[PDB]
Design an enzyme around this catalytic site. Structure first.
Site, short mmCIF file in Angstrom:
data_model
loop_
_atom_site.label_atom_id
_atom_site.label_comp_id
_atom_site.label_asym_id
_atom_site.label_seq_id
_atom_site.Cartn_x
_atom_site.Cartn_y
_atom_site.Cartn_z
N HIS A 1 0.87 -1.14 0.00
CA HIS A 1 0.00 0.00 0.00
C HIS A 1 0.92 1.20 0.00
O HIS A 1 2.13 1.07 0.11
CB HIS A 1 -0.86 0.10 1.34
CG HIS A 1 -0.01 0.09 2.56
ND1 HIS A 1 0.07 -1.00 3.40
CD2 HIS A 1 0.88 0.99 3.02
CE1 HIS A 1 0.94 -0.73 4.36
NE2 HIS A 1 1.43 0.47 4.16
N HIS B 1 5.05 6.11 -2.60
CA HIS B 1 5.72 4.89 -3.08
C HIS B 1 5.07 3.71 -2.46
O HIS B 1 4.35 3.86 -1.46
CB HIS B 1 7.23 4.89 -2.70
CG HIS B 1 7.48 4.94 -1.22
ND1 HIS B 1 7.41 6.11 -0.49
CD2 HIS B 1 7.75 3.95 -0.32
CE1 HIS B 1 7.68 5.85 0.78
NE2 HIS B 1 7.88 4.55 0.92
#
Length: 184
Positions: free
Chosen positions: A40, A125
């Site tokens: 995630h 990211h």
């Protein structure tokens, strides 16, 4: 236990990143890889919080999410942190991350009112694994360079979520405390 706010990816992205992890594997470096359910985008780490802060944060996130529209982003590129020479973490980048960035900055400003430090320099990211040590530097750098601008897939940023991780004898377990849908 330790709470944080995140954006989950979809199944198509998860599948593609897991295959990319396999392709990296453990021959050029000892890597502790992220489990598939835990891939995630982290927007903010909160630490240990009280039930009252949590409630207050859920109210704030509800209002923030409704200010942003659902949008499609692409997971593209492998990055390394902190630096190519010296590899500690292998990440996948996000293409068109500006609205995510905007949300994470809005989150940091509002939670600042509750005493949480603004950490700044946000970078969207997805962490793919943590390098314990490198075995074949050249080989690792070669495999990461081939992936540098790789199109792994796309997903709709649907909601921001409040999660927490708890260490248990069999390792850390992650739970979703609440989920706040972006505006359609």
């Amino acid at each position: 236990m330790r709470a944080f706010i995140a954006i989950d990816v979809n199944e198509s992205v998860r599948d593609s990143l897991v295959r990319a992890q396999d392709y990296i594997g453990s021959k050029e470096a000892k890597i502790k890889f992220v489990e598939r359910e835990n891939l995630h985008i982290t927007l903010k780490f909160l630490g240990e919080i009280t039930e009252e802060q949590a409630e207050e944060i859920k109210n704030i996130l509800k209002k923030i999410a409704e200010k942003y529209k659902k949008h499609e982003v692409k997971v593209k590129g492998i990055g390394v942190f902190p630096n190519p020479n010296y590899i500690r973490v292998i990440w996948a980048g996000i293409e068109n991350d500006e609205i995510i960035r905007e949300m994470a900055r809005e989150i940091e400003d509002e939670l600042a009112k509750l005493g949480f430090k603004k950490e700044g320099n946000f970078v969207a990211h997805i962490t793919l694994g943590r390098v314990k040590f490198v075995k074949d530097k050249l080989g690792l750098t070669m495999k990461l360079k081939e992936l540098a601008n790789e199109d792994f897939g796309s997903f709709v940023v649907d909601a921001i979520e409040l999660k927490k991780s708890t260490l248990t004898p069999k390792g850390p377990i992650y739970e979703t405390l609440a989920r706040f849908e972006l505006s359609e």
